[PDB]
Design a protein around this nucleic acid. Sequence first.
DNA 1: AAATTTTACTTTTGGTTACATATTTTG
DNA 2: AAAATATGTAACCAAAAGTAAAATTTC
Lengths: 110, 101
Amino acid sequence: AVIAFGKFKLNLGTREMFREDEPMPLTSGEFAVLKALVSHPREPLSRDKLMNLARGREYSAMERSIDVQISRLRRMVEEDPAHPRYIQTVWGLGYVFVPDGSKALEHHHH
Amino acid sequence: AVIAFGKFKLNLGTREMFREDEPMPLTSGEFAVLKALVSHPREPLSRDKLMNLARGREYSAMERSIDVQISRLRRMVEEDPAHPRYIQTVWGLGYVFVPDG
DNA sequence: AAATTTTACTTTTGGTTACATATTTTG
DNA sequence: AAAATATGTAACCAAAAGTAAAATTTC
C-alpha cells in the first residue's frame, strides 16, 4: 500500500507519488529502485541485490547505474541531496532506506 | 464477466464497454488490446505477448502498431493521458494494467 | 467509407563516461 | 604520506516510447 516519509507519500501498488499531497511522476526505473529501498525498511541493500530487485539483471563493480539512479532520486526526494536523510549510503555495501526515528540495521553474526 | 476501473466497466464477454454506465463503442482492435492488459492485472505484458493475445501475430523488433493502440486507448480511458493510471508503460518491457484499489 | 498498420518526427529515458570528492589502506 | 579503493553527479547520447499524419488494408 502507501508509504510515507518526510513530505512524500508513495503508493507501491500504483507507482503514484505525492509531495505534500501533490502528484509527482516517477519514471519506471525510479519507482523500481525506490520501491526496493522502501519495501525493505532499514535493510542495507547491496548494489547486487538492488540491481537484482529493480531490474532483474546482474551487477558489477564496472557499473554506476545504481549510484546514478540513487543520485537522481535523492535530488527529488531529499530536502538536501548533499546530506541525505532517507536514502542513505552505507559505505562499501550500498544504500538503505531509513524511516524517521530510525537507524539503519546492523547485522549480528556468529 | 465485467472488470471495473475508474468510471469504466469493460464486460469481457458481452464485449462492450460503458463509461459512466453510458454505452461506449470500441473497435475490435482496441478491444483486443484492452482485454489483454485487463485480463492480466499487474502483470507487465511485453509487446511480443501483447500481439499474441490481441492480434494473433508475432511482432518484429521495431514496428510500433501496439504503441499507437495504447496511445489511442489512453486518449479515451485516462483522466490524464499524459500521466496514465490504469494503462501504464513499463520502460523496456511493455505495458501493464494496474487495477483500481 | 472505416479501421489499422506503418512512416517520420519528437520527447523521454537510463546507461556510460569522466572526473571530483571521500574513505580505507599501505597494495 | 601516498596509494588504492568507493562514492557523487554532471553531461553526453543511443535506445526507447508518444503520436500525428500518411500509407495500407479491410479475409
